[PDB]
Write a protein that binds this DNA or RNA. Structure first.
Ligand code: AMP
Lengths: 640, 249, 253, 248
DNA sequence: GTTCAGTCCGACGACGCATCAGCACAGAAGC
DNA sequence: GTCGGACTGAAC
DNA sequence: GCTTCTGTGCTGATGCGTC
């Protein structure tokens, strides 16, 4: 009986402490119990221990059931490059719950709002619609198979077929599996553990109880007789091995069978980087300015480059003559850029058969020979590969090289990689360039390069080591490079003061409290508040409670006549406009959703803040003395 | 090799349209008794029975009892091809993973092969039991009742008394009810009553059932405590459809 | 304690379906003389007037004058569950939050009863005494419907020019413009066009409301329009031995 | 100038109904022989031709050979205004961008004026061919079989022999066929020179069939390597043909 | 050895293509 | 995209 | 004529993928 299953016991045992027969399909109840235990614990190590405990039993008892258990734990449906999506939002699943409970929608809507979690509303109420066959127990293989079925059934009236499958899952629930299934569907599984931690749990399990042993296996603890420190040293070295082995091939479907069949030490001998298999991109830490750059890099050579304000593109060229592109997140971008597919033979040297490149693509002004803002880039059509009628011209901007001709280059110092990059490629201005790069260690030189960057439409500077700690491997550190954004390197960016007129009730950490706020600018020539943005970030938890209690008494049953809102979502309560908040922003964009400054720059397209960050309440001002539409228009004109 | 022929292929069209929106996959059992289906719904809330009696066919011949799985979507898109006047042949080769049909118009012949599928059979043997109410009514009026009730509420309370049946429901508008009385043939209302009974049902399922109305102008509803509701359509000398709906509370 | 019994319930169907889209809600005055309503539309451009004369009910029982607030979309769904040949009863308790609707089959077999929750409304009414309008037309309903359904494609507005010999409707738009002429006619009463008119008018209106106004067309095979300078057009359907319905639409520019 | 009258204006309604969905923009070429149009579709796979004989008009004056550029979708939007019973008058100026339609029912007059446009027209000369298989068959039968086969598979194989034509569809759902055998307006006739098999994509034939209410009979013309010809015989007025390039 | 330092995990945001739904009407077919 | 928050190691 | 339906978009409404 899995309802008594306790992996959090001391002295955990792989088969003795299990709750089903050998060879059997794993009861989904056990996975839900484990998620229940994981929610009970705040200690990350203890959570990874408990997950490794379950994983160890799974590979001991029912080897094929492994992959579903991982993808369940990953809240994912397969390889990210396969493009699978569940495609079911809050509204559809909410209706599914109302029908499974037999309730009307509005009570359960307000209930899920107040607890800010679909989980706890998924149990409780019951349809009383007594089935003629009580359902079989849920199995983790069956549940994952239903989630890929849900993803697959598109077309007209598809919502009916979704509602029917999800129904069967809900009515089949046994103890408390409903909460975890509902959170699992809604993306917000809130389990408090992700990719790096699950791979840790995998390494720990597959180390202690490796695969391929005949049941019952005679060995259970590879750590037996080792000191707890030297145990941990063995665990962690297998950690780095596996994590890098994951980052070179970010897909369990490739890794897991070969792992089960050959053992984790021989695993790399079968797995190598190649185009046609994606890789994780490179990461960077935020830094405020030059001192921290000089301190972090105090004994390493480095260079300075622009951060062009585009999007990343991962370029695969195969000797077979097709090319593939992936986004920053391994999503399969081929179909977005069939023109770039055509540009490949004029970008490479012909002496190169295959490559993997990391590059930024940015929209370009072909006649003005200059960059345009990112709100032009996001206008591209998505799926179909009709290169014929290109409305948005695009230029490529190289910054790093990953693979060439057969040699993988990831183990290599950046200096050599940039050397080979320049030496084995050709440029074409406004079609393909290398990123503007400047090699230095000194202050006012960087200040001059920054001033050129901001006036040449770039988010800041990129700072990277040339050789020391200048290999690509994400496992040592993911965030090796630095970004020097204008936002605080200016000392102060575009900071504004705006009027709060409404709140959004929060969920998860934000549950019970407000999670976001609605802001307006004071339009004096109408004397009205016009909506400008929401806020959802940059404030701590104690000051969160301070804002919540301060706001709670000022809620109103109606929107005031001195408030203009349109397209912006209705606040979860209406709030009297008496408070003004100081905030920074990254950029200003023409909004189709925000009435502020309508007709001051264009009659119909409004404006809004990209990336608003809370600072502090500006409690000394009255609301009418906050930022007015005139300064908003001046600021946006001063952006250009 | 199994072969069956009917002049009234319109029956087959009406039948599959009566099945369509309820289930997507089913395995059909064929015997010397004829063609028979059991299938629970993918929600496990309601079940269909099919009977086609072999003697109802103009031509029928069987070597073996067959259980073939069929995707109801594609095969109904195929059955759309038949005109209302067409003579249908169904043929199955015993080990085929495809099913052969011919449509014959009263110099033109339509020929089809549809791929089969392999299915993990769920079937429930319904016990024969008596029911505290049996009602014989016109299909068309039942259709109006159910379609009407669809707007007003989501669940129905069905009440029976010797004086006449009563259907009631409610929603975010108020309450709706119908009291329907007996007559004094194809237009008639008649009852086989045993005791005054009240049960609850989910109208979305009855609206799915109603699609069979063009099969027979009159129908049996059979209702008893603590058991599924039976709706049965007797297709004329050909067989029947039965639908079992589990109750609420 | 009101009762109305009506034999021809399809009348109520056809009148109610003309408002369900125009206005989501309404208020209904009941009095000894009959049933009355005046409402503004949702965008507050046009006005609807409704009169059902008590004489036309098969049975009557106005024990009080009442003003029910009613969601027309809900009542529309409800009567979309009413039979055409059915004989309709409305019953209202004075003290209730409900209107009872009960229906009896011609075969006496099928009895329907539904009850609808009432509510209050913030009634705005405007006084519109009769005026001796400068133009009056009677003409075939299906004709005008077809004309509006045509010309709304061409351009968003129509200009109507009347002279004693006949009327011309003009619409102008991006592909071009179109002018339809109608003459007065005689010796076809029901299919004829009649004009009583005092001076040649030329006025402009937005067809996005005209396509709404046409939705009554099955009520009366003839329609009247009336024009006057600097005032709303009136459009009226005569409810057969029962009442009338009128639209008032204010002039553009 | 140009000045025409047609009593059976429903013909021209059905004509413009046929074209609007396939080709959006076109050129009207006018002559003493009547009205003629050739045009190539937006995918450039299929060509249409309309022939209207001037003698079929109830009244007809052509002073010059015009070439008028017209948005067919907007033209159809105008033509929806007439009832099928309406008598139609067409009136053209020489320099004008603008064409007058006068509609009259059997006591009402519609005056409509359409602005023209300046267009790149692609021309294909079509010399005579004799087609190896010529099928004359009742139109609705073809239309319904097309709408059927659209589900079985996006492509068709057509077959002819002197004893009958067979139309086969093929896809993951299954494969299917219709046989037809040679048998007044209910009859099917074939003239066959050489037995044929051809492969085609259905999307276009689905479009062609919208002309069906123009004619009780349709004629199929087939020969090796050439586009399929489908023809709608307008009674005494002229003809309407579609050419479709066979696949690969 | 603890005041720092970096990991890692989930809070929230602004756009926009896709992408499907929900009346609502012409249309044809059946009566 | 971005900022805070809980946790194990960092190294002066 | 009316029926119920079917195929018809037209315009709206969020899910999901970027930063
Ligand atoms: O702000 P962020 O954390 O998302 O930044 C990382 C992204 O910055 C883009 N970018 C632009 N230019 C470069 C260069 N020169 N080097 C590295 N990254 C660069 C990328 O899109 C990256 O994901």
């Amino acid at each position: 009986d899995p309802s008594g299953y306790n992996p959090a016991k001391n002295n955990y045992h792989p088969v003795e402490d299990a709750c089903w027969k050998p060879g059997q399909k794993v009861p989904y109840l056990a996975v839900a119990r484990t998620f229940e235990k994981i929610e009970e614990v705040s200690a990350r190590l203890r959570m990874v221990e408990t997950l490794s405990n379950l994983l160890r039993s799974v590979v001991a008892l029912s080897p094929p059931d492994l992959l579903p258990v991982l993808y369940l734990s990953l809240n994912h449906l397969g390889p990210p490059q396969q493009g699978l999506e569940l495609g079911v939002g809050d509204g559809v699943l909410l209706k599914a719950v109302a029908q499974a409970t037999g309730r009307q929608l509005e009570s359960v809507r307000a209930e899920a709002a107040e607890k800010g979690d679909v989980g706890l509303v998924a149990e409780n109420s019951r349809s009383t619609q007594r089935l003629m066959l009580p359902p079989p127990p849920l199995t983790a293989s069956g549940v994952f198979s239903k989630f890929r079925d849900i993803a697959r059934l598109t077309g007209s009236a598809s919502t009916a077929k979704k509602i029917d499958i999800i129904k069967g899952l809900f009515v089949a629930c046994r103890h408390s599996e409903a909460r975890f299934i509902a959170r699992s569907l809604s993306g917000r599984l809130r389990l408090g553990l992700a990719e790096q931690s699950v791979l840790a749990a995998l390494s720990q399990a597959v180390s202690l109880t490796p695969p391929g042993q005949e049941f019952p296996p005679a060995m259970v603890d590879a750590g037996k007789g080792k000191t707890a420190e030297a145990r941990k040293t063995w665990l962690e070295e297998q950690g780095m091995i596996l994590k890098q082995t994951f980052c070179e091939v970010p897909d369990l479907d490739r890794i897991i069978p070969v792992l089960l069949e050959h053992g984790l030490e021989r695993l790399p001998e079968h797995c190598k980087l190649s185009p046609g298999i994606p890789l994780k991109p490179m990461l960077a830490h935020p830094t405020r300015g030059i001192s921290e750059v000089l301190k972090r890099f105090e004994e390493a050579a480095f260079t300075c480059e622009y951060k062009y304000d585009g999007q990343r593109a991962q370029i695969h060229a195969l000797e077979g003559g097709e090319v593939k592109i992936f986004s920053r997140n391994q999503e399969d971008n081929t179909g977005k850029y069939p023109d770039i597919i055509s540009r490949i033979p004029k970008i490479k040297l012909p002496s190169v058969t295959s490559f993997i490149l990391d590059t930024e693509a940015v929209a370009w002004d072909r006649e003005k020979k200059q960059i345009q803002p990112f709100q032009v880039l996001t206008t591209r059509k998505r799926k179909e590969v009709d290169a014929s009628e290109i409305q948005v011209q695009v230029c490529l901007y190289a910054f790093d090289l990953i693979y060439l001709n057969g040699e993988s280059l990831v183990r290599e110092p950046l200096s050599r990689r940039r050397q080979l990059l320049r030496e084995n490629f050709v440029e074409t201005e406004g079609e393909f360039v290398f990123a503007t790069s400047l090699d230095t260690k000194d202050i006012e030189q960087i200040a001059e390069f920054l001033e050129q960057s901001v006036k040449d439409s770039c988010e800041g500077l990129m700072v990277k080591t040339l050789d020391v700690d200048a290999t690509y491997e994400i496992a040592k550190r993911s965030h090796n490079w630095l970004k020097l954004k204008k936002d605080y390197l200016d000392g102060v960016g575009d900071t504004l003061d705006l009027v709060v007129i409404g709140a959004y009730l929060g969920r998860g950490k934000r549950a019970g409290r407000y999670g976001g706020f609605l802001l307006a600018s004071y339009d004096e020539d109408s004397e009205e508040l016009q909506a400008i943005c929401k806020l959802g970030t940059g404030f701590s938890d104690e000051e969160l409670e301070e804002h919540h209690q301060s706001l709670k008494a000022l809620v109103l049953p109606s929107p005031r006549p001195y408030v203009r809102i349109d397209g912006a979502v209705i606040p979860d309560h209406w709030l009297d406009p008496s408070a003004v908040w100081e905030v920074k922003c990254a950029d200003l964009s023409l909004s189709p959703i925000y009435p502020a400054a309508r007709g001051l720059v264009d009659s119909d397209k409004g404006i809004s803040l990209r990336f608003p960050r809370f600072i502090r309440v500006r409690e000394d001002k009255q609301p009418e003395q906050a930022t007015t539409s005139a300064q908003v228009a001046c600021l946006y004109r001063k952006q250009s | 090799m199994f072969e069956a022929r009917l002049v009234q292929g319109s029956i087959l069209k009406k039948v599959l349209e009566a099945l369509k929106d309820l289930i997507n996959e089913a395995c059909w059992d064929i015997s010397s008794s004829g063609v028979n289906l059991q299938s629970m719904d993918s929600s496990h809330v309601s079940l269909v029975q099919l009977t086609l009696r072999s003697e109802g066919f103009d031509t029928y011949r069987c070597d073996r009892n067959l259980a073939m799985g069929v995707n109801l979507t594609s095969m109904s898109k195929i059955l759309k091809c038949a005109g209302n006047e067409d003579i249908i042949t169904l043929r199955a080769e015993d080990n085929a993973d495809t099913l052969a049909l011919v449509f014959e118009a009263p110099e033109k012949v339509s020929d089809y092969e549809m791929k089969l599928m392999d299915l993990d059979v769920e079937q429930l043997g319904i016990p024969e039991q008596e029911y505290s109410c049996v009602v014989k009514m016109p299909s068309g009026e039942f259709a109006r009742i159910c379609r009407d009730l669809s707007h007003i509420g989501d669940a129905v309370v069905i009440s029976c008394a010797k004086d006449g049946v009563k259907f009631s429901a409610s929603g975010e508008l108020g309450n709706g009810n119908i009291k329907l009385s007996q007559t004094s043939e194809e237009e008639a209302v008649t009852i086989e009553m045993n005791e005054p009974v009240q049960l609850t049902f989910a109208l979305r399922y009855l609206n799915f059932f109603t699609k069979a109305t063009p099969l027979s102008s009159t129908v049996t509803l059979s209702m008893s405590a603590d058991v599924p509701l039976v709706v049965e359509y007797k297709i004329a000398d050909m067989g029947h459809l039965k639908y079992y709906l589990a109750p609420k509370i």
